[PDB]
Design a protein around this ligand. Structure first.
Ligand SMILES: CCCCCCCCCCCCCC(=O)O
Ligand SMILES: CCCCCCCCCCCCCC(=O)O
Ligand SMILES: O=C(O)[C@]12C[C@H]3C[C@H](C[C@H](C3)C1)C2
Ligand SMILES: O=C(O)[C@]12C[C@H]3C[C@H](C[C@H](C3)C1)C2
Length: 581
């Protein structure tokens, strides 16, 4: 057997060459692109020898062996990576483990600049393969733990955006939003992978299994508990392995679970047919994104099994996690309109009540009201969504963002201005996205996107802590994270930042910036204004922002923009200072 031949045949040459590029860029993060292209060509040539004849020299070696051997042939391995060259002195599997240990998650490479649209469209046009591959390389070496097939899926979407937009009348008006959306989707995917892994370390496999029970049950509600339970057990093993970070082992684990699911469609879901006709590379991806199946009609209420039955405490006590899993399965499959975390809150509530009540002489009487305890937990996120979507509709995206900016600056004014801006804007984007869903779809959508916004915040904060309240929210159970953040109040102890005239000076270019860059400059100033006058009322802030808008309208219409911005700017600042007192 030749695993390399098998992979080449299953993936196809184009996918194989792209995944080899990613694999090498993620380990050899400092080698130039042209060196990688040469590694990829040599691996591909060799793979083709194996495709032609699985008995040919070296074709029977394992992928790990061949990949390691290839890394160890890199002439500059010691000069560039130091310790990582010491990996070559090991045999397998120690060698591969040593390579994994020496990938660098923060590699100190310059930020990837978005060039001008015409520059990008010209290069895309002039050498499409090089254009796309080089950026694949740039991103992969900066995100060495990003799962390589997912990276490849994104690359195909980028390729599609350039293909469409570079042939359009207004290239920029077509392309830039598509790049913005793909940037966000990429970061959401990246953050979800990090979430799952840190969660698995920080909270244990039990927590992750509860999450999976809830999510799979919503997705595959016609599946029986034992089937959901098997998928949960395998999914946990898969995520366990993928977090260890060996791409091949992770891929085999994912492909095995995808094969299982596809051979078992009739006992899992009616929505999988399309996914299960895809080639191996895309199958597991497609399954992970499948829409929820329709739930069975005429499912009974949970009262009989979970409250009224004389056997609740007996069934619970004999196998606690199994019985709670059943509860979560039954609740989730009936509620695809709930967030996963909401379902976990309800399961945790159910658990807390059984633990208390099953020790009493009359358990039945003590847990008789447990379903009533669920009502306020469900209503809290439904009501927050309703209120936020109504506010979003009244204000529009930009002013909604500004309302959040003001409120979150007052809550946690120690956070850096850029972070407050980025978070507030992203929360507004969650509003945009999720408020276009009907009520039924709103809570899962908000959970997913908020999870990435709050994670991006928590990552920043953990690297540069500024607030004990934020620390607490970021380090609590991920279940309680969003309610802990919702419980934040205005900071009563904060000392106003001292006035700085430069902070509130604006220049003529603001008139001609993109809407996004103009917005970010205004939002920055708004945060600074709140940090300076954290007790300003909504009326007072609105008066200042209205003057600002008048000021920008007047100076952007003026002939001599530099002097208007300077002179009208000084008048604005002085007036505003006297208003806010
Ligand atoms: C503030 C921007 C988001 C727009 C929608 C409001 C979000 C409300 C939180 C919904 C609950 C998410 C999941 C949960 O914690 O149960
Ligand atoms: C201390 C007073 C100096 C502040 C002067 C005016 C500050 C401008 C407010 C920030 C931008 C408003 C946002 C907007 O309306 O788009
Ligand atoms: O494997 C593939 O087909 C490819 C490999 C690269 C270049 C181009 C666009 C993306 C990324 C998918 C083709
Ligand atoms: O700015 C962005 O979002 C990016 C930055 C680089 C890499 C990739 C494709 C292009 C160029 C746009 C993402």
């Amino acid at each position: 057997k030749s695993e390399v031949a098998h992979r080449f045949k299953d993936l196809g040459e184009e996918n194989f060459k792209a995944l080899v590029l990613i694999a090498f860029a993620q380990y050899l993060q400092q080698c130039p692109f042209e060196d990688h292209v040469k590694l990829v060509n040599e691996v591909t040539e060799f793979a083709k020898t194996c495709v032609a004849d699985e008995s040919a020299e070296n074709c029977d070696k394992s992928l790990h062996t061949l990949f390691g051997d290839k890394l160890c042939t890199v002439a500059t391995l010691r000069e560039t990576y130091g310790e990582m060259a010491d990996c070559c002195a090991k045999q397998e599997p120690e060698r591969n483990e040593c390579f994994l240990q020496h990938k660098d998650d923060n590699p100190n490479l310059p930020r990837l600049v978005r060039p001008e649209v015409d520059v990008m469209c010209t290069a895309f046009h002039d050498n499409e393969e090089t254009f796309l591959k080089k950026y694949l390389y740039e991103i992969a070496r900066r995100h060495p733990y990003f799962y390589a097939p997912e990276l490849l899926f994104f690359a195909k979407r980028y390729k599609a955006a350039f293909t469409e937009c570079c042939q359009a009348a207004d290239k920029a008006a077509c392309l830039l939003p598509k790049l913005d959306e793909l940037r966000d989707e990429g970061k959401a995917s990246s953050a979800k992978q990090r979430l799952k892994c840190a969660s698995l370390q920080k909270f244990g496999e039990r927590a992750f299994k509860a999450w999976a029970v809830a999510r799979l049950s919503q997705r595959f509600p016609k599946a029986e508990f034992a089937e959901v339970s098997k998928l949960v057990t395998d999914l946990t093993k898969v995520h366990t392995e993928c977090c260890h970070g060996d791409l091949l082992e992770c891929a085999d684990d994912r492909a095995d679970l995808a094969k299982y699911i596809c051979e078992n469609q009739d006992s899992i879901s009616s929505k999988l047919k399309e996914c299960c006709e895809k080639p191996l590379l895309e199958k597991s991806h497609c399954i992970a994104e499948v829409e929820n199946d329709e739930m069975p009609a005429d499912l009974p209420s949970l009262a009989a099994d979970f409250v009224e039955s004389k056997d609740v405490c007996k069934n619970y006590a004999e196998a606690k996690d199994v019985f709670l899993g059943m509860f979560l399965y039954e609740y989730a499959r009936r509620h695809p309109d709930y967030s996963v975390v909401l379902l976990l809150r309800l399961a945790k509530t159910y658990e807390t009540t059984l633990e208390k009540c099953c020790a009493a002489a009359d358990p039945h009487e003590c847990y008789a009201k447990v379903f009533d305890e669920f009502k306020p937990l469900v209503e809290e996120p439904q009501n927050l969504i309703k209120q936020n979507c109504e506010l979003f509709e009244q204000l529009g995206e930009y002013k909604f963002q500004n309302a959040l900016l003001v409120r979150y600056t007052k809550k946690v004014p120690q956070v850096s201005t850029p972070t407050l801006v980025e978070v507030s804007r992203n929360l507004g984007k969650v509003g945009s996205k999720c408020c276009k869903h009907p009520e039924a779809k709103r809570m899962p959508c908000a959970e997913d996107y908020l999870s990435v916004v709050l994670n991006q915040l928590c990552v920043l904060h953990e690297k540069t802590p500024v607030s004990d309240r934020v620390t607490k929210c970021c380090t609590e159970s991920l279940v309680n994270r969003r309610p802990c953040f919702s419980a934040l109040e205005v900071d009563e102890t904060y000392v106003p930042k001292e006035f700085n005239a430069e902070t509130f000076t604006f220049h003529a270019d603001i008139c001609t910036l993109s809407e996004k860059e103009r917005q970010i400059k205004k939002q920055t100033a708004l945060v600074e204004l709140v940090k300076h006058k954290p007790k300003a009322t909504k009326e007072q802030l609105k008066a200042v922002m209205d003057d600002f808008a008048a000021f920008v309208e007047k100076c952007c219409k003026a002939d001599d923009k530099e002097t208007c911005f300077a002179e009208e700017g000084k008048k604005l600042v002085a007036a505003s200072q006297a208003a806010l007192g």
